[PDB]
Amino acid sequence: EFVEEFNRLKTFANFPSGSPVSASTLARAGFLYTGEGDTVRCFSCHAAVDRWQYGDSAVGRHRKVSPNCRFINGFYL
Amino acid sequence: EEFVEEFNRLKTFANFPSGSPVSASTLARAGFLYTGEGDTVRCFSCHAAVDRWQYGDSAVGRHRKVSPNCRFINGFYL
Ligand SMILES: O=C(Nc1cccc(C(=O)Nc2ccc(S(=O)(=O)O)c3cc(S(=O)(=O)O)cc(S(=O)(=O)O)c23)c1)Nc1cccc(C(=O)Nc2ccc(S(=O)(=O)O)c3cc(S(=O)(=O)O)cc(S(=O)(=O)O)c23)c1
Ligand SMILES: [Zn+2]
Ligand SMILES: [Zn+2]
């Protein structure tokens, strides 16, 4: 369902174009856009991450908050 | 586990940045433990990791945003 990158990238309507991390990178890192600020939420682990700066790795920050996430550990590949 | 008591979460805040916009007691009261890196904290219940704290932040408000279904935040611990 949200296993498809493309469907996750559909949730990034109205995501801020100002953000230093693109919607594309985020969706590839397993995230959906919450529709509030730059807060994104993983479709698998349901954990969220916010406050993106220049140079963040979306995958890195995702591993940091949920090192045991199925997405991040390659369950869906 | 043992981190249900606020005082036990407060004990994990050794070496927390003195300059933090949000104090250790505010964070421990919001359910958080200090991971020992930067200003990164982690809820004992829902495992949400939060960092980059700024003036204006509510520790509980940010907690709820990242994990609206967190057991701790919804009073599951009496
Ligand atoms: O836990 C969560 N998430 C979580 C938790 C609580 C609430 C919410 C929440 O708010 N949910 C929702 C919000 C919004 C929406 S939405 O707005 O609707 O879109 C939701 C929609 C739906 S729906 O399905 O689409 O309807 C469903 C949910 S929901 O999640 O179902 O409710 C939603 C989310 N994820 C997770 C998953 C997998 C692995 C890990 C992981 O890595 N854990 C760990 C990390 C680090 C450490 S560390 O301390 O060692 O570093 C860990 C230590 C230990 S320890 O050694 O045992 O102490 C144990 C773990 S453990 O967890 O691995 O056991 C650790 C974490
Ligand atoms: Zn995840
Ligand atoms: Zn929590």
Q: What is the dihedral of CA B48, A6, A14, A70, to 10 degrees?
A: 0
Q: How far apart are CA B33 and CA B60, in angstroms?
A: 13
The amino acid present at A59, given as its one-letter code, is: V
CA atoms within 13 A on the CB side of B1: 5
Name, in order, each residue with C-beta under 8 angstroms of B69's C-beta and a sequence gap of 6 or more. A46, B46
- State which of A3, A68, A70 you would mutate to test the pocket of ligand 1, scoring each by most atoms of that ligand within 8 A of its C-beta: A68
- Contact yes or no for B31/B43 (Cβ under 8 A): yes
The amino acid present at A14, given as its one-letter code, is: N
Tokens 């991971």 sit at which residue?
B35
All structural domains of chain A: 1-77 (1.10.1170.10)
Residues in chain A within 8 Å Cβ distance of B69 = 46
Q: Is B27 exposed, middle or buried (0-12, 13-18, 19+ CB in 10 A)?
A: buried
Please report the atom of ligand 1 found closest to the CA of residue B66.
10
Tokens 């520790």 sit at which residue?
B59
Q: How far apart are CA B44 and CA A2, in angstroms?
A: 28
Name, in order, each residue with C-beta under 8 angstroms of B9's C-beta and a sequence gap of 6 or more. B3, B28, B31, B32, B33, B44
- b/e map B39-78, b = 16+ CB within 10 Å: bbbbbbbbebbbbebeeeeebeebbbbbbeebebbeeeee
Q: Is A69 in the pocket of ligand 1 (CB under 6 A)?
A: yes
Q: How far apart are CA B12 and CA B45, in angstroms?
A: 15
Residues in chain A within 8 Å Cβ distance of B52 = 51
Q: How far apart are CA B6 and CA A6, in angstroms?
A: 43
Residue A62 CA, ligand 2 centroid: distance in Å? 6
